[model samples]
Target: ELDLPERNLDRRELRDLVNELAAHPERWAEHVMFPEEGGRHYASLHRDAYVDVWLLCWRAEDDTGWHDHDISSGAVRVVAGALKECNPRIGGEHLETVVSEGESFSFGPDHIHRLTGAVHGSVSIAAYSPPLWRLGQYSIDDSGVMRRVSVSY
Candidate 1:
């Protein structure tokens, strides 16, 4: 038997990686994070210069506001329950929603979206190549002022 090294995974490749990881709960069972009163919980499962893997748990109403990964491409696999994903339309005036469960989605470095736990909530795994460094949160004011805040990931 032989094994090959994987590096610089593309969006589809990363999505496949996460989906494969989701199939083996035993590997990450001990690292599952449950939502807390303070916020949705997440644990770093693995990290290196090339990639980082995370295990996250979400409860009803839990959300990651509209944001962008500054320079990394990433993928996520919903292992259990459901989640709603919202991405801005071309003009940014509206959002498109996708509900996922036992499904995987991928995005590039410039992609921006928000994820919220639906109904009974969800458990998921995410992988980012080049790892996440800076994140940008997006918001709009009542008066139509759009703002972005940068934060460490």
Candidate 2:
């Protein structure tokens, strides 16, 4: 039986969770994947009823478009290099930040943002409690109407 924690986790707790995975790279080594063409690669290191762990590799120009985890709260730890997270705002404004190696950040189920590689490539580990079942992609139409398209993960 899995004894993984349930419910929404706070930022510090999520950071500690990802840090624990960082400490045990052996558990996720075999699941890593790095592809060519500068595209991002995703691999599920582990998954169960309680949580899902993912290993992600990023190359320059690789970005995840604005999206949200419909029902899962997540935490991401930069294992190597750096990456940037972008959150768009109304009136063309946006918030962006770089997360360097060994840094971790957490987001709730309702958070919407995009991620991309920084100056070089990067590797990260992420965990989602209760796992990720649905994702919502966001976009603004020419008329400035916000649109959301949901998809199963």
Candidate 3:
């Protein structure tokens, strides 16, 4: 049998998978690329019944507006530079975390957060469980209320 899990991987397993893949440049080095400012490249890496993988290359100034996986929990590993993950935009102080090179982070299916680059020209690998067929994009209205718009991937 092929060396693969019978079921979809959970959050922790997803993290391990991304981390290991990020450490091995041999697997994805050729996919690395640079995108225009305010833009990012989402290069397809691997996909199966249980998971989806991608190689994301972007500039540090690019900001991924707040969004959610819809039904998939996900994980990311930084292979080249770093990213700042921001969350909970309602409070006096929003929450955020920085994942640098060789560092990995995981989030639940319902977790809504924004990702911004920390260093110029960064590369990262991301994996999503059960894959991502759609995404819930978020924004704040002029009334100070959070709004969500469903978008297909």
Candidate 4:
């Protein structure tokens, strides 16, 4: 994995950072997340107190579970196919999945969401906060008990 530099850029700077990566389509495949036909890949560009950059790739079936970066803010920009970006209800009760294409969406500290490759698959770049700490993974038990587990990368 490529341990990218530090994240320390403003929104405009971050956008430009991702924009630069989006220009190099060939670099996408170099960082593979899965060996199967459909998967996701990413390259961490930088990590700093203000911002973080990651070049991500996803095929039709790759998905991310429900989780929230503890107080971190971010935005996702599509570089390839479309994707289903889902936001979970507060208290981890439900989910609202929406399809996002070559568009981009920004989120605040309270946005608890998950992402998955759309039926047609897709790729995108995500810029986030630096020093990403523990994240909360939301899960519900078969008995209807909700849980928020803290995880670190």
Candidate 5:
């Protein structure tokens, strides 16, 4: 394992990064892509020691599923169109929000949520602290078993 300086950022700091990233479309505009067949198109915008930024174009069916960032705080700023965030719990009140263009949202490392494109041609700028090293995907399998799968990034 490589030893490196820890750069755990809070929600505000992550939000700041996404906001800054969203403003300068000139740098990322060329990378924007909307899939015609209805899916997600992703482009890597920037990466550094402390942060990683990505630009995503979404069709109506584009979704992130229910997932969590492993040990990373994250934020997303809508560059164009809108995105829907759904946080569902069995015993708790279901929560959802539609983040429109120029708006932003942030979450902690432990936060579990689903992201989807609200419409065709929707675009979003996503950022994460300490770069994405791992992720946890939550899903329901056959036989009604809820499962979590971990992956390397």
Candidate 6:
């Protein structure tokens, strides 16, 4: 990816990068695939190795169930509206949820979470590292059966 005029990244580097990506709606627009069990999705991988960036548009009722990035770490920037992040926890009952707007957040290599759409619709940009591979989709059933699969670009 060609570098854009992103300034003062260190102050809020993650946010800066996310906001920069959010600023460009066309660059990261892509088709996302949501798995059958978990509403979570896997964005179509990009060929660019420099930095993997993707754009996502969610309708008022759209959502990404429960999922996680296998071994990847990345940040999300909300562009238009807002969304909720359901933090992963050993006990589903103990999971924490946070709703954010016009902000950016980063996840660690072991972080896992779920996202749900807001009422007025929204747009966001997600930038990932080493790309995405192997995802765990948590089901609604009490059984915590984890299914691992290969990632595609």
| TM-score winner | 3
Model 2 lDDT tens row, 1-153: 224676655556766788888888786767666687655688877677667778887777787899998888889999888999998877678899999999999987778889975545578988887678788998789997889999888
Which candidate has the highest lDDT of all?
Answer: 3
Better of 2 and 5 by lDDT: 5
Per-residue CA lDDT of candidate 3, range 46-85, in tens?
7777788899987866787889989999999988888998
lDDT of 1 by residue, 34-61 (tens): 6567877888877777777888888886
lDDT of each: 0.80, 0.80, 0.83, 0.66, 0.81, 0.60
**Candidate 4 per-residue lDDT over residues 23-135, each given as its tens digit:** 76564555535335634566666555566667666656677788887777677777766777887665756665564555776666677888874654356778776545668
**Which regions of candidate 2 fall more than 4 Å away from where they truly are?**
1-11
- Indicate the TM-score of model 5: 0.87
Tens-digit lDDT track of model 5 for 33-152? 777775468887766677777889888888898888888888999988998899978855868898999999898888899997477888888888868778989888687678889988
TM-score of 1: 0.87
lDDT of 3: 0.83
In TM-score terms, candidate 3 sits at: 0.90
lDDT of 3 at 88: 69
- Scored against the true structure, residue 138 in model 5 reaches a CA lDDT of 85
Model 3 clash count equals: 0
Lowest lDDT 10-residue stretch of candidate 6: 4-13
Off by over 4 Å in 5: 1-8, 37-39
Q: How far is candidate 5 from the true structure (C-alpha RMSD, Å)?
A: 4.0
Higher-lDDT candidate among 3 and 4?
3
| Candidate 2 residue pairs that clash | none
What 10-residue stretch in candidate 2 is worst by lDDT? 1-10
Task: Tell me each candidate's RMSD, in Å, in order.
Answer: 3.1, 2.5, 2.3, 4.0, 4.0, 5.5
TM-score of each: 0.87, 0.87, 0.90, 0.72, 0.87, 0.67
